[PDB]
Design a protein around this ligand. Structure first.
Ligand SMILES: CSc1sc(C(=O)N2CCC3(CC2)COc2ccc(CN)cc23)c2ccccc12
Ligand SMILES: CSc1sc(C(=O)N2CCC3(CC2)COc2ccc(CN)cc23)c2ccccc12
Ligand SMILES: CSc1sc(C(=O)N2CCC3(CC2)COc2ccc(CN)cc23)c2ccccc12
Ligand SMILES: CSc1sc(C(=O)N2CCC3(CC2)COc2ccc(CN)cc23)c2ccccc12
Lengths: 242, 242, 242, 242
């Protein structure tokens, strides 16, 4: 998270951290609980190469990384079959927890959007994670979950920005229909925030509008963060999650 | 270059090194002389972000990098407008030198393929450059130019290799029609070879079949090197080069 | 700490952590609480070059670095005037807390040894700290205070071992009278432990035999850890500390 | 070499480079040819720990590191038995070449000073080497041999300077009688220059005054470069070198 601050313990009960086995169980990507047995994440966090499920653990909503880990094994990794790179798209994946979750008050599921929700510019939107706090700067210990409010920008407004300072022909779409743009030179997600939730408050309900995907660096001039547009992939998601 | 050895002094008169300004004029990509005033290279060497011409130099064939240079300024940089990433395609660019070079037998142009050459599986193909000699292993001093013979692998055969150990649907194609596969687990190109030539002898003529473009690591099981297929951009090229 | 084990929450209430101001208040050395307003550490941690008090903080006994930080400012740094490098000796310094500590049960001073105690081989000694767990191998998150039981080795024998495999003349003393040796190839202190306490259990009471000073790497053959011999500088310490 | 400039090809024919075995024969220290079969260098380049002769080779006067290497094996390494660290002193060592050198106009010996030469301030002195061009800043390729003229300083003044902004007692010696100081905030030796020569032109003859030994950083205020004072070890040297 670039800009924004440390999150209150009550907010973002759906936030999860993904761990890879090493010298310690290290955070590498974010995620969200969308069902007591299912986590939504970014395909590039776990793909496109096939990886050992034993090497992976999920940690549910924690205020600081590592302090009180209760790591959770994973039974299935479902990566969207159109995915190969985040720029080509379909950067979305599903993890099946080995057991459904103890759904309390501090941890519970985020609500998915109706297929009809567009999230027009001006909607109140927040992204959260334990990623870098600027380009090439790790989040310092004790690793607090951070949050930032990011301004949404229309895909076409955003697409044109991406052509500023670029050789890429104007007729060539950089920001694709299954994507969504948000953030500015002061508010953004970054490396390590990947696969994490972008949530907007619509009529009093938090809906996950996006999954953190990619971008040209973090909070760079004319390079807003790019998210997987969740609505776009609702059918593929409901095919697997109850 | 992975595998392969130092190139003899006579071989590869069309090889060049691209140099970015810094504490010294550091090699970052390969390239080739295709006309006395034009250099062929990879788009991702010089894009998609727009570069400062003043910070770029061309160095014609040297046996050893940095020992002594005769850096040549560039007057234009043409990046294929379709390019955004190497995986999407169109990984190709042209550098116009500020002055034409005076060609000799130690430094002259490479011949481009006829507008329909095929390059079947097998076939004598060589790739050269000053890039890494393995995954995360720099070419050591005195930085000799390296060559390696690499077997072409048919596009369809190669695309199927690329789906092994991958989540990506067999209907989704990773190796595109503007791309070409070469190399194996012992013989391959690597970081810093990007933009350099893949050449094949055809009826006693060296033709440039490919530009070093990308791959999944270097010399990795079932992940041959990927090249921009030159034949596919002949028309584009000839719009700019006499 | 090489080898050993995470310290139990009720042990070593005199352990302190030294923090330097940066992107976060980072641990760089240990120290011990020997008086409610004084902390004992190594000179090489804070010298020989004079530093700014403002950029230094002290953290009292914590089970996990950084998590419940309550940084304490210091009003004075006193460094033994005979100190230039760890090898030459006099590697010992004092920090005056700006304010005295409210001695809890989880936080109290350690006892200094009487001038008469030489800590023979065979004594139950521990060294504790948050340093590296091996040569060039950081303590992983969440940074549990570690402890290791270390075998004391007599100076003359230790000094002789330091000559094994070295060019240095047997007549040249490497291990001085104001130093003390402890540890083997499975048990040792390391980088990040400097300044912390070596304590021994004598006649019911914990005495601080040593301050973590230097060595040739950590847990290397014929290279035991070197500590500053506390008894050697009692006068100096008592000049400042009631 | 900090400050300064590339050396002419005809200058300093006694300068050598020391190489350690690895992925390539990498420069790690300078030295100087004092006899057709003997190299003079710093002890901290080869000790205090004893190492494999096989792992070491010597390169004679060469303009650019690595370009036309003719590496010479070494038959014997003799380190001064008083050496333990540079700060303690006796930072001097001799390498015996396996076979004598064919001296010429481009490679020959430097002359050792008489016992009575103090090298007072005002003498014209140079240091040469392939070391860092500033703190944390490698000599860039093609790795030219460098030189810098450095002002000599008297010992008592050098010693006192080193106490400026240090905790060390004014009466505790930092710069010993076997050392010699030269340099300022603009001209100095650095990491990788170690062991190479410092020469002064006395009565029309170049003499070796010192051996690059140590210092606090490079070209830091009040921290001139510190050299092993060659006259001090003349008897030791003459015990091995005809
Ligand atoms: C021209 S396409 C292109 S961009 C890009 C790039 O600069 N990255 C650096 C920042 C990354 C994406 C990758 C790191 O993880 C996150 C998370 C959020 C955001 C949104 N603030 C941005 C990022 C690449 C890295 C390799 C290969 C092609 C790449
Ligand atoms: C899943 S698509 C994907 S692969 C890949 C990857 O593994 N790289 C490492 C090796 C690179 C390509 C990039 C480095 O330069 C050369 C040159 C030749 C070859 C042919 N041997 C291969 C390479 C990426 C790096 C960032 C963003 C998406 C990437
Ligand atoms: C021959 S004198 C000599 S040794 C040495 C060395 O190897 N270091 C690496 C390990 C260090 C000391 C320094 C790192 O901090 C701690 C803490 C405890 C221990 C005891 N387990 C050992 C160490 C030096 C480093 C520079 C300058 C002269 C040095
Ligand atoms: C307080 S004693 C102290 S200084 C110092 C330090 O700053 N170093 C960095 C610069 C070094 C000496 C070591 C690196 O190689 C050369 C060569 C020439 C010069 C002359 N400009 C200076 C240097 C140490 C490093 C470890 C252990 C005690 C050290």
């Amino acid at each position: 998270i670039v800009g924004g601050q440390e999150a209150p313990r009550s907010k973002w009960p759906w936030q999860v951290s993904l761990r890879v086995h090493g010298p310690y169980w290290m955070h590498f990507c974010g995620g969200s609980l969308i069902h007591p047995q299912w986590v939504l994440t970014a395909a590039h966090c776990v793909g496109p190469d096939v990886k050992d499920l034993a090497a992976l653990r999920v940690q549910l909503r924690e205020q600081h990384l590592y302090y009180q880990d209760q790591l959770l094994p994973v039974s299935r990794i479902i990566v969207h079959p159109q995915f190969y790179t985040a720029q080509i798209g379909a950067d979305i994946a599903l993890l099946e927890l080995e057991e459904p979750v103890k759904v309390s008050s501090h941890v519970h599921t985020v609500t998915l959007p109706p297929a009809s929700e567009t999230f027009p510019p001006g909607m109140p939107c927040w992204v959260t994670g334990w990623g870098d706090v600027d380009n090439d700067e790790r989040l310092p210990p004790p690793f607090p979950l951070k949050q930032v409010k990011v301004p949404i920008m229309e895909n076409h407004i955003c697409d044109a920005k991406y052509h500023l300072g670029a050789y890429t022909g104007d007729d060539v779409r950089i920001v694709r229909d299954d994507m969504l743009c948000a953030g500015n030179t002061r508010r953004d997600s970054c490396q390590g925030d990947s696969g994490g939730p972008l949530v907007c408050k619509v009529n009093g309900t938090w809906l996950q509008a996006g999954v953190v995907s990619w971008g040209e660096g973090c909070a760079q001039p004319n390079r807003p963060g790019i998210y997987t547009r969740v609505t776009y992939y609702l059918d593929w998601i409901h095919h697997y999650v109850p």
